[PDB]
Amino acid sequence: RTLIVTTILEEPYVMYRKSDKPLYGNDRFEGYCLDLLKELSNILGFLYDVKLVPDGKYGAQNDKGEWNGMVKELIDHRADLAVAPLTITYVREKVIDFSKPFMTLGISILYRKGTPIDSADDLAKQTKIEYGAVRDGSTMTFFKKSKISTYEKMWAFMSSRQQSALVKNSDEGIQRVLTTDYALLMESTSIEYVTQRNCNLTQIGGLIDSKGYGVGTPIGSPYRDKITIAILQLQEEGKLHMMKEKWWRGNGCP
Amino acid sequence: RTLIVTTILEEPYVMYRKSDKPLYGNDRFEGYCLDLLKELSNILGFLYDVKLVPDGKYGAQNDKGEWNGMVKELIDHRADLAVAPLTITYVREKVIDFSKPFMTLGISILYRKGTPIDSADDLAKQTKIEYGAVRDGSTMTFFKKSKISTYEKMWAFMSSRQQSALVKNSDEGIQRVLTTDYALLMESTSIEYVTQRNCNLTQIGGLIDSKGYGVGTPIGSPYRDKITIAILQLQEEGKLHMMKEKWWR
Amino acid sequence: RTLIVTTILEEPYVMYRKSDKPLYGNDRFEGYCLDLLKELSNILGFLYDVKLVPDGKYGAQNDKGEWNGMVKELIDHRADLAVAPLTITYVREKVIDFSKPFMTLGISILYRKGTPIDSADDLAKQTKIEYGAVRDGSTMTFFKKSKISTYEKMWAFMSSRQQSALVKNSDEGIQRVLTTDYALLMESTSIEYVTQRNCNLTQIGGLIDSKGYGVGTPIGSPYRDKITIAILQLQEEGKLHMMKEKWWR
Amino acid sequence: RTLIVTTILEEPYVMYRKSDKPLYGNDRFEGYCLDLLKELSNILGFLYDVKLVPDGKYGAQNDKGEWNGMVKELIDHRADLAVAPLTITYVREKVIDFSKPFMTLGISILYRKGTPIDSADDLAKQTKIEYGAVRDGSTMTFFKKSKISTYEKMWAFMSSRQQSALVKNSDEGIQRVLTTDYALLMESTSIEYVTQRNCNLTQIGGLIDSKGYGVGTPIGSPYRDKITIAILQLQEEGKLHMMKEKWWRGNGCP
Ligand SMILES: C=C(C)[C@H]1CN[C@H](C(=O)O)[C@H]1CC(=O)O
Ligand SMILES: C=C(C)[C@H]1CN[C@H](C(=O)O)[C@H]1CC(=O)O
Ligand SMILES: C=C(C)[C@H]1CN[C@H](C(=O)O)[C@H]1CC(=O)O
Ligand SMILES: C=C(C)[C@H]1CN[C@H](C(=O)O)[C@H]1CC(=O)O
Ligand SMILES: [Cl-]
Ligand SMILES: [Cl-]
Ligand SMILES: [Cl-]
Ligand SMILES: [Cl-]
Numbered sequence A, D: 001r002t003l004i005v006t007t008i009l010e011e012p013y014v015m016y017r018k019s020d021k022p023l024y025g026n027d028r029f030e031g032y033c034l035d036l037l038k039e040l041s042n043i044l045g046f047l048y049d050v051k052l053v054p055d056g057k058y059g060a061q062n063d064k065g066e067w068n069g070m071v072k073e074l075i076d077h078r079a080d081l082a083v084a085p086l087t088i089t090y091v092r093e094k095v096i097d098f099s100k101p102f103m104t105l106g107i108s109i110l111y112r113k114g115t116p117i118d119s120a121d122d123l124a125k126q127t128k129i130e131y132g133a134v135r136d137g138s139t140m141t142f143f144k145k146s147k148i149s150t151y152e153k154m155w156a157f158m159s160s161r162q163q164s165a166l167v168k169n170s171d172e173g174i175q176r177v178l179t180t181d182y183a184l185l186m187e188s189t190s191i192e193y194v195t196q197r198n199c200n201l202t203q204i205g206g207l208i209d210s211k212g213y214g215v216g217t218p219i220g221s222p223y224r225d226k227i228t229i230a231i232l233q234l235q236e237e238g239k240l241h242m243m244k245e246k247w248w249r250g251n252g253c254p
Numbered sequence B, C: 001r002t003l004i005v006t007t008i009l010e011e012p013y014v015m016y017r018k019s020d021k022p023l024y025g026n027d028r029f030e031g032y033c034l035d036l037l038k039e040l041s042n043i044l045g046f047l048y049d050v051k052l053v054p055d056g057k058y059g060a061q062n063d064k065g066e067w068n069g070m071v072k073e074l075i076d077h078r079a080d081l082a083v084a085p086l087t088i089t090y091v092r093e094k095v096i097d098f099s100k101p102f103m104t105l106g107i108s109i110l111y112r113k114g115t116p117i118d119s120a121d122d123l124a125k126q127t128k129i130e131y132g133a134v135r136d137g138s139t140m141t142f143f144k145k146s147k148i149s150t151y152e153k154m155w156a157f158m159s160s161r162q163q164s165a166l167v168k169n170s171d172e173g174i175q176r177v178l179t180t181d182y183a184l185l186m187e188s189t190s191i192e193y194v195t196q197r198n199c200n201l202t203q204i205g206g207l208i209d210s211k212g213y214g215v216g217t218p219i220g221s222p223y224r225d226k227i228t229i230a231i232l233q234l235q236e237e238g239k240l241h242m243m244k245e246k247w248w249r
């Protein structure tokens, strides 16, 4: 049968292909996650139908404990796989079955060049430089759920004033960094992609934590273990590394 | 029921506790993996019995394709869990159910300081400096199975002369690096621990791959997903980081 | 049964948690004493409900000898435990059962930096600099009841002019020290916290006595000895020290 | 009735009085603890009979979980109070009812003057300078029971070679410090007493922990709370402070 794959537009993981003609079906998309999906398909022998998540969200839990985004798509069995930069977290792993990571990463800081700023600590000990994260993303959830002091502190600032320091998406975060005195808490993988296209931007400091992106499947899915096995193979063969090189190269920045 | 936990002595993950008197049961052991196991048992509410793997192996296949080591213990249901620096790999994941990694790592190079060697490619291009890995470990298997040109070249070197360039265990590899002109392909986390204790040694280059250590369970185990979830929580709370800091310094 | 825990807002022991949205129940509060209470509940296995003391007092007697504050709450069995910077004193210990101290302290002097004042004796000998304490706190009562010459002199000064030199609470005492020529007799642990946040202020001299904060229970409570034992264990494990470090820095 | 008070000889808490005639009864003894006992007696209105603990020990638990020393005296109801420098610890509080502390203290280091040594950390990071504690005392038990790294380390050294770095009592520890390259882990109160009599000795660093001496009573004793109340009063009246000054003065050392 044919698997329904939920995904979301996010450079360079999943993007609209460029063409002069209207596009249809899976041919609408290209990017790292599409190449990964093709490799998984070839290895496991399934057909797939790529569908953008209707609410345009990744997956977060509200006050009632109700889920949204690609996570909710899986929970309701409206999709068989989620293939996207979907961060493997404690709260999400409790509600879906993630494959093992196809890409590792950590929270870090995107900022303009030329400044004394060197760490998260630097930001937490002042109020002049604004800083935030994408609202309801795993990065925000990390700061909110944290019981570590410095990150407890950054959260209190981030969420203050009705969350005015937060952004709705990465592109908005990037523009805010480029225009104003603002630093975006962003996943290192996305920082690496952006800083190789726009030589005005840089990563500040190292990785604040350690996690990965995983293919999402519903709890009890027969495909999860098979996908994990295929990802392990692709990693061992150097394939995932090439795929990352391919999509992350960009224009080149020093 | 008290869970049977297979493991293996390996610094600083699992070590004999130093005492003036004889030790018994779980009290014989200390280290990163013991601290992990204690945290896991508290979170999930299980009792456990730590048991050294009888053949003292991690887990590989012979030419007949029979497994050994901690991996065989799980396949055969002689253990409920394996808690050790057991590398999550394609071959192993097909026969047991790993939790998600509690520690990430990659293959890198342990060598002495002060050399001009800067990468695996530097080693592959030459024959003066000897290099190898622990026989039947995931690192050796990585080289054996690679179709990458540089790594194929390295594998031909390592398997030459009836695998004289290989060592039986990490301690042997370390002494070999210290004494002779030899570089050990070794997991990055272990190199970190070694170079903090041997100030004449260093890591050469970066990581040539990306993988993890996971808790091993038999295929179908009801503990695997619970342990994954517990591990994700310990990571997010910064406890795993703290545990590594304690044992690595 | 869920235990009723009486307490009082006082930095940094018990504070309202900062949030963008309204808070409810125990989630309203954070601080040293909340961390202590959580550790205690985990060790002893009790659930608890934190309740601010309705009259907002620690616990003293009026001239009729009736008690108020958290102390009265315990005497009257309106609370199971009091967890707060509640000083273990002779008068209080006679009417409630304190656990052993979770924190030690002594009365000392909070004053501005750059003065030549070096001791309580320096204050007692003069009348230019005003000094006082929080009305009805254990510090005031210490001075009221002392037969030590220097402390008697200080008490006559403090009770002069209808106790104009006294303040209703610590925050008031702190602002008074910052603004005017005034020294506050204050518990050393609180001075430590204040001087880390007000870099123009300092402790003057050493501790003039030795006492502790303890968890309060009604006389006869079956929780008192268990809580003492839990506290001794947290102290020995270095956890209380860590808890203080977290909140005081 | 008359209370049986178990105690042990330890300067300057409990000592044989000096006299030219043989001494009997309570008149054999003097020191801080005797003055404290007298004050407690006057306040509560009891008579007392002071008895040295027969096995000459404070109180520690063996392999079977059997107790000895003054602690065991109380457990077996052979004594009503223990009045001595008996350290209030977790393991002991589980088996007797301690009063609240009459004196506070912490573990610290007794050593010869003139050295670079400044902390416990200094000692733990070498093997040349020997260091230990009184065998089976609460200080030893602290290092043994510890899960803190530096003290975990010191314990392993201390207990090595069949505990050759340990001593049987404080006097032996003091002589060992004065004669050899040895540092004694000792309670600060006793360090203060010794360093004011022997100007060749000094405390190294500060307090490693925080505890007190308490009057011991058996679990369920009717006297414990009354004694706590009396101690609180004595402390508030400045009496305990004077008593300490009186017995700790010694010869004077810079
Ligand atoms: C909003 C984006 C782009 C996603 C991607 N991974 C995280 C997630 O899966 O929640 C989010 C990023 C972040 O929270 O920094
Ligand atoms: C022989 C050791 C120490 C083990 C540990 N992890 C790898 C494994 O789980 O196979 C081996 C190391 C290596 O192959 O570099
Ligand atoms: C009014 C406060 C803050 C309390 C705290 N402890 C003492 C008590 O428990 O009475 C008071 C302070 C003092 O009297 O210096
Ligand atoms: C061996 C002595 C003198 C006693 C005194 N207090 C401790 C106790 O009550 O165990 C011991 C000292 C120590 O362990 O440093
Ligand atoms: Cl530009
Ligand atoms: Cl998994
Ligand atoms: Cl081969
Ligand atoms: Cl008590």
Ligand SMILES: [Cl-]
Pocket (backbone or CB within 6 Å): C144, C159
């Ligand atoms: Cl009066």
Ligand SMILES: [Cl-]
Pocket (backbone or CB within 6 Å): D200
């Ligand atoms: Cl001399």
